[PDB]
Structure formats: structure tokens, C-alpha cells
Amino acid sequence: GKKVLIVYAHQEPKSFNGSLKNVAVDELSRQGCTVTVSDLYAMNFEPRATDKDITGTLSNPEVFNYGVETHEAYKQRSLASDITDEQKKVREADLVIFQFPLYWFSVPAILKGWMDRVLCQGFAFDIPGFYDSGLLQGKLALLSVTTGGTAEMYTKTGVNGDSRYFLWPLQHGTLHFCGFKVLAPQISFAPEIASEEERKGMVAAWSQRLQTIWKEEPIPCTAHWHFGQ
Amino acid sequence: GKKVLIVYAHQEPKSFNGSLKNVAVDELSRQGCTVTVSDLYAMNFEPRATDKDITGTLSNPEVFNYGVETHEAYKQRSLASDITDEQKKVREADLVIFQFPLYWFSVPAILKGWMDRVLCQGFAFDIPGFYDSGLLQGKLALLSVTTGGTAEMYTKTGVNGDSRYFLWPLQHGTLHFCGFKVLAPQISFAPEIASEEERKGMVAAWSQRLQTIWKEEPIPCTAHWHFGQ
Ligand SMILES: Cc1cc2nc3c(=O)[nH]c(=O)nc-3n(C[C@H](O)[C@H](O)[C@H](O)COP(=O)(O)O)c2cc1C
Ligand SMILES: Cc1cc2nc3c(=O)[nH]c(=O)nc-3n(C[C@H](O)[C@H](O)[C@H](O)COP(=O)(O)O)c2cc1C
Ligand SMILES: Oc1ccc(/C=C/c2cc(O)cc(O)c2)cc1
Ligand SMILES: Oc1ccc(/C=C/c2cc(O)cc(O)c2)cc1
Ligand SMILES: [Zn+2]
Ligand SMILES: [Zn+2]
């Protein structure tokens, strides 16, 4: 059996992102997978990395260092419960799907907040214990992104550059760093201006891909894959 | 005369980021510049893009579209006051400095939230004004970043890749898109493991660069600058 966590970042359930999340739950549940959804806006998920993320005595209350304090709080079991709840969902997952609209060539801040606060030292990685030795090794991760910009816009010679260029901080700096095996991203280009038929085709392509998701190999998460260098 | 806005994202005033922000205020104020600081954690700045960003009634209450609603709210002077306050600081600025520690090869979520919510359609860009024609054309922007990783790690053959690879979503996808002239980033590598003398050298390098900031030309914000090749 497999456990899937869907980390979802969209305000509107009737949106195209909402439809992609719903077909992921539908298809994976049909396969007999165990499915969990962290609907960040519905949870009013806290995005800010603050001293409220530590419930116990701070290691150094004179000079607050978020990384040091959260690492110590993880080992002491004194992290805020909203962080621990997400870490339990991640720890048990075989696959983590991130479903979000592209905001400024990145994740919406609420999802950036989940990354910043949930993936702390001792949990996601350690020093040493990062990249191929990351603590989330063996787990799969997949970015399912929607854009405003068209596929043509997202080309080497297009105004936005190749879509792989913006994946680097998420895929390499974050997911690879934590030891995830990164599956090929699902990019659904410009659904808002696409036709009804094209929108249906994009949802069908995602549902169809999920049917064989457990057969895929991860991408080689390198500078050459992202930039051709 | 010149107006400078410093958008600052660090929880601890005694930090290295705090020292960089303080020397930027000191040097620019000494030059006779008009200086404003948006200390995001001190303001408990809201990072989430929600329907609370629009005051009064929505354009379409049946299906909530953040982009459409904020664009309409901007034209109708119906945006939340925290957004409008930031837009006034940006509108008047000749230079916007972003001072932040690197979080997951990107900005901390609180600063990602400022970008998501402040830089709305009608304000920062429109059709036709984007990239070179962006509504913030003529304004300068500068990313002053601190990292955990060393300069050696941030090379093309290093574990993290070239530091220019992670700048693409911030410099091109956000700042250039809005029409800013992007000044060369200030990257201060691994201050935490640097000696007291090295930390002083990095702060002095920033203070010295600010002395001739108004003489600089912006970078050519292209795929070739970031990835070339
Ligand atoms: C704050 C904000 C920033 C955005 N930044 C980008 C961007 O960098 N690139 C892009 O192609 N679209 C961008 N968009 C457009 C969204 O990606 C697009 O509206 C969304 O993917 C459509 O999916 P949906 O219908 O489910 O909302 C942005 C939208 C918002 C609200
Ligand atoms: C949530 C989080 C994520 C981080 N991600 C990165 C990263 O992607 N790359 C990096 O080199 N350092 C990363 N760091 C380390 C910080 O960038 C580093 O501690 C900071 O720049 C030091 O500046 P300061 O002493 O003023 O805090 C991260 C730290 C935190 C808390
Ligand atoms: O609380 C924390 C959470 C995350 C981090 C991440 C650090 C990091 C450092 C690098 O050199 C490369 C990278 O890809 C990530 C540090 C503290
Ligand atoms: O409120 C907002 C609504 C829409 C957007 C879109 C941004 C965007 C940024 C890019 O670099 C390329 C692009 O094709 C689109 C930003 C803010
Ligand atoms: Zn990688
Ligand atoms: Zn550019």
C-alpha cells in the first residue's frame, strides 16, 4: 500500500487548482492509496518563521536564531503543534504532491511558509545528512504547478525563459536537499485563458499520469537538467 | 534627492541581517537620502493572499480569483490598508533594497507574502506594462541576501550550484517583470561560520558599495546573465 500527502495552496475550491487536487485525491483513492490533504488556506496555515514556533525555553533568548532554535526544539519535542502535525503527515507519506498556482516564479507565500517551518533540521535534513543523504530519502515529491503564462512564454527564447529555470529553488534547493526523489513536474500552462476542451485535456493528462505514478523514475535533479549547462 | 525603501525580513535585530540593514540606513541617511524601512516581522506583516485583501464587496463572490479581485480592488481603491501602505512606500521610492536571509533558495515566506500581495496588477504591472515596460520602470531594486552555504558551495560545480541560479525567480520573474532596473545582488556568504573580522569585512563591503550606489548600472536581467553559457 502507499500513503500520499497533497500539500494544497489555493483559496478557491472551484478553481483549476481545486480540480487538479480533486482528481489527484480521486485517482489515488481509486488505486487504494491512503490520501491526506493539507489545504493550507482552509487551515489558515501560519507562514511566518517566528519564536512562537518554539514552545519551550529558548536555547539563546538574547540572540534569536530561527534555524538553531527550531533544530533544538525538534530534538526536545518543543516545536509548535501545527509544525509537528505536518511533520507526521510527511514522515508517513511515500509521495508528497504540492498543488499550487505559480506566484512570482515560485510557491504562494502560505506554501513557502509550510516549506520554511515544516522542513527543519533534524526532521528533513541534518548536517551531515542532506542532498542524497537527506533525512526524507526514499520519499517521492512532485510539483503540480499552474501558470498565468503560456507554454510559449516559458521557453528558452520566450519572455519567461524555460519553465525548468524556475523549478531550481523548489526541486534542488528544497526537495533534493531534504533527500526526496523528485518526480518530473506536472506543469499546466495558462488554464485561465485555455479553452474548455484544453482545460479538460490538462485535467485528463494529470489523472492519466497519476495512474502510473508508482512506475516513474525521478528526474536527475542537477544543474544540467534545469539549465542545459 | 533620492528616496530609498528597505524591505527587511529578519526576526532578530542583533543578527548579521540586522547589521546589514542598520549600515544601509546609516550610509543612505548620511548621504542625505530619504529612508524608509518595512521591518516585516516587527509589523507582523500578513503573508497570505486571501479575500481579506479586498475591503467591501467582491467583483465575483461565487468564484474567488485573487489576481482579478486585487486588480479590481486596486482600480477601485478597495485594497487592504497594509497593502496600500506598502504600495505608497514603493511608488515614492527610487530604490528598493530587500534585506533577507536565504530560505530554501528564496525569500522567507513573510517577504514572499509582501511580494505576492503588494505587487498587484494595476500597481506593479499591466497589459502592456511588464518586463522592460513594467509599471515600476525607472525604479532600482537590489537583493541583499545572506546564506548558510559557503561561496564554494554556490558554484557551478558546487553542491548548491551558481548563486545566480537561485536569483532567477526574484530578479527576472518578479522584479524585472514589474519593470525594476535590477542592480547586482549583494550576497554575503555564510556569515554564521565566518570570523568576527570576516563579518566586519562583509558589512564594510556593503557600506562601501552603498557609497556609490547611485553610479551603478543595472545588470542585463536575462537568461544568459543567470545561466550562461
Ligand atoms: C501573486 C500572483 C503572482 C503570480 N505570478 C505568476 C508568475 O510568476 N508566473 C505566471 O506564469 N503566472 C503567475 N501568476 C498567475 C497564476 O499562476 C495563475 O493565475 C494560476 O496559475 C491560474 O490557476 P487557477 O485558475 O487555479 O488560479 C500569479 C498570480 C498571482 C495572484
Ligand atoms: C527555513 C530556513 C531555510 C534556509 N534555507 C537556506 C538555503 O536555501 N540556502 C542557504 O545557503 N542557507 C539557508 N538557510 C540558512 C540561512 O540563510 C542563514 O542562516 C542566514 O543567511 C544567516 O544570516 P543571519 O545570521 O543574519 O540569520 C536557511 C535557514 C532557514 C531558517
Ligand atoms: O531551519 C532550517 C531549515 C532549512 C535550512 C536550510 C539550509 C540550506 C542550506 C544550504 O547550504 C543549501 C540548501 O539547499 C538549504 C536551515 C535551517
Ligand atoms: O496579483 C497578481 C496577478 C498576476 C501576476 C502574474 C505574474 C506573472 C509573472 C511573470 O514573471 C510571468 C507571468 O506570465 C506572470 C502577479 C500578481
Ligand atoms: Zn537537485
Ligand atoms: Zn530579467
Short mmCIF file of N, CA and C in Angstrom, two decimals, chain B residues 2-5 74 86-98 114 118-119 123-125 131-142 171 174-183 213-214 216-219:
data_model
loop_
_atom_site.label_atom_id
_atom_site.label_comp_id
_atom_site.label_asym_id
_atom_site.label_seq_id
_atom_site.Cartn_x
_atom_site.Cartn_y
_atom_site.Cartn_z
N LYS B 2 17.16 61.50 -3.22
CA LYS B 2 16.70 60.14 -3.52
C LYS B 2 15.93 59.54 -2.36
N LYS B 3 14.93 58.72 -2.68
CA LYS B 3 14.10 58.02 -1.70
C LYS B 3 14.45 56.54 -1.77
N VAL B 4 14.72 55.94 -0.61
CA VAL B 4 15.06 54.53 -0.52
C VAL B 4 14.08 53.80 0.40
N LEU B 5 13.60 52.65 -0.06
CA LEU B 5 12.80 51.76 0.78
C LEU B 5 13.61 50.49 1.04
N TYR B 74 -7.57 47.38 -6.67
CA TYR B 74 -6.56 48.43 -6.87
C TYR B 74 -7.19 49.62 -7.63
N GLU B 86 2.24 49.81 1.84
CA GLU B 86 3.46 49.33 1.17
C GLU B 86 3.57 49.88 -0.24
N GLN B 87 2.44 49.93 -0.97
CA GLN B 87 2.43 50.47 -2.33
C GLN B 87 2.82 51.94 -2.35
N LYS B 88 2.39 52.73 -1.33
CA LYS B 88 2.78 54.14 -1.26
C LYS B 88 4.31 54.25 -1.09
N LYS B 89 4.92 53.40 -0.22
CA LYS B 89 6.37 53.40 0.03
C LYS B 89 7.12 53.04 -1.26
N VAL B 90 6.61 52.05 -2.00
CA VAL B 90 7.21 51.61 -3.26
C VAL B 90 7.09 52.69 -4.34
N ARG B 91 5.88 53.26 -4.52
CA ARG B 91 5.59 54.30 -5.52
C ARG B 91 6.56 55.48 -5.38
N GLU B 92 6.86 55.87 -4.13
CA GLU B 92 7.73 57.02 -3.88
C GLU B 92 9.22 56.70 -3.93
N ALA B 93 9.60 55.42 -3.77
CA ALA B 93 11.00 55.01 -3.76
C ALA B 93 11.68 55.10 -5.13
N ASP B 94 12.96 55.50 -5.12
CA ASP B 94 13.80 55.49 -6.30
C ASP B 94 14.52 54.15 -6.30
N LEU B 95 14.76 53.60 -5.09
CA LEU B 95 15.47 52.33 -4.89
C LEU B 95 14.78 51.50 -3.81
N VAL B 96 14.59 50.22 -4.10
CA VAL B 96 14.02 49.27 -3.15
C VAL B 96 15.10 48.23 -2.87
N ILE B 97 15.56 48.17 -1.62
CA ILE B 97 16.54 47.19 -1.17
C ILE B 97 15.77 46.11 -0.40
N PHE B 98 16.02 44.85 -0.72
CA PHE B 98 15.42 43.72 0.00
C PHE B 98 16.53 43.12 0.82
N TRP B 114 4.87 39.68 1.06
CA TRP B 114 4.94 41.09 0.66
C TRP B 114 4.93 41.17 -0.87
N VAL B 118 1.72 42.93 -2.39
CA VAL B 118 1.99 44.33 -2.71
C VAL B 118 2.04 44.59 -4.23
N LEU B 119 2.71 43.69 -4.96
CA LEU B 119 2.94 43.85 -6.40
C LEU B 119 1.78 43.34 -7.27
N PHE B 123 -0.89 48.07 -10.19
CA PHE B 123 0.16 48.74 -9.47
C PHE B 123 1.54 48.50 -10.03
N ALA B 124 2.00 47.25 -10.05
CA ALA B 124 3.35 46.89 -10.43
C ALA B 124 3.49 46.58 -11.93
N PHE B 125 2.42 46.13 -12.53
CA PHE B 125 2.39 45.74 -13.96
C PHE B 125 0.99 45.77 -14.50
N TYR B 131 7.86 43.38 -17.83
CA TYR B 131 9.27 43.34 -18.05
C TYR B 131 9.79 44.77 -18.35
N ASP B 132 10.50 45.00 -19.45
CA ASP B 132 11.06 46.32 -19.70
C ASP B 132 10.06 47.47 -19.59
N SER B 133 8.80 47.22 -19.92
CA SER B 133 7.73 48.22 -19.85
C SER B 133 6.91 48.18 -18.51
N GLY B 134 7.34 47.37 -17.53
CA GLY B 134 6.68 47.26 -16.22
C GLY B 134 6.40 48.61 -15.57
N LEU B 135 5.28 48.71 -14.80
CA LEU B 135 4.80 49.95 -14.18
C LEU B 135 5.77 50.55 -13.17
N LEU B 136 6.74 49.76 -12.69
CA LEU B 136 7.75 50.25 -11.78
C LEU B 136 9.05 50.60 -12.53
N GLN B 137 8.97 50.84 -13.87
CA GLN B 137 10.13 51.21 -14.68
C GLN B 137 10.78 52.49 -14.16
N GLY B 138 12.10 52.52 -14.21
CA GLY B 138 12.88 53.65 -13.71
C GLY B 138 13.33 53.45 -12.28
N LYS B 139 12.61 52.61 -11.51
CA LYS B 139 12.97 52.30 -10.12
C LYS B 139 14.08 51.27 -10.09
N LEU B 140 14.94 51.38 -9.11
CA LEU B 140 16.02 50.41 -8.94
C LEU B 140 15.63 49.41 -7.85
N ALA B 141 16.10 48.18 -7.97
CA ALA B 141 15.87 47.14 -6.97
C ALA B 141 17.18 46.42 -6.75
N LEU B 142 17.42 45.99 -5.51
CA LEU B 142 18.64 45.32 -5.13
C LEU B 142 18.33 44.27 -4.07
N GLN B 171 14.88 38.06 -9.31
CA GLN B 171 15.33 39.11 -10.23
C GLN B 171 14.50 39.20 -11.51
N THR B 174 10.03 38.32 -10.87
CA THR B 174 9.37 39.32 -10.04
C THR B 174 9.79 40.77 -10.36
N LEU B 175 11.03 41.09 -10.05
CA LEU B 175 11.50 42.44 -10.16
C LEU B 175 11.54 42.97 -11.61
N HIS B 176 12.21 42.27 -12.49
CA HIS B 176 12.26 42.68 -13.90
C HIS B 176 10.85 42.71 -14.47
N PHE B 177 10.01 41.71 -14.14
CA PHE B 177 8.62 41.66 -14.62
C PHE B 177 7.85 42.95 -14.29
N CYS B 178 8.10 43.51 -13.11
CA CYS B 178 7.45 44.72 -12.64
C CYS B 178 8.06 45.99 -13.23
N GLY B 179 9.17 45.84 -13.97
CA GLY B 179 9.84 46.96 -14.61
C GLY B 179 11.05 47.52 -13.88
N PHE B 180 11.42 46.95 -12.71
CA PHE B 180 12.59 47.43 -12.00
C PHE B 180 13.86 47.22 -12.80
N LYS B 181 14.81 48.14 -12.60
CA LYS B 181 16.16 48.02 -13.11
C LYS B 181 16.83 47.28 -11.95
N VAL B 182 17.31 46.08 -12.22
CA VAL B 182 17.87 45.23 -11.18
C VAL B 182 19.36 45.52 -11.01
N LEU B 183 19.76 46.00 -9.84
CA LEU B 183 21.17 46.18 -9.53
C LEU B 183 21.77 44.84 -9.15
N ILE B 213 26.23 53.75 -4.87
CA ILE B 213 25.06 53.02 -5.36
C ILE B 213 24.37 53.73 -6.52
N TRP B 214 24.36 55.05 -6.49
CA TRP B 214 23.72 55.89 -7.50
C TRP B 214 24.53 56.00 -8.79
N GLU B 216 25.94 53.09 -10.17
CA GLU B 216 25.84 51.76 -10.77
C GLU B 216 24.89 51.66 -11.95
N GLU B 217 25.20 50.79 -12.89
CA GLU B 217 24.24 50.41 -13.91
C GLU B 217 23.56 49.08 -13.49
N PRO B 218 22.32 48.84 -13.89
CA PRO B 218 21.70 47.56 -13.54
C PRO B 218 22.32 46.42 -14.35
N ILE B 219 22.08 45.19 -13.91
CA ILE B 219 22.55 44.01 -14.63
C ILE B 219 21.67 43.82 -15.87
#
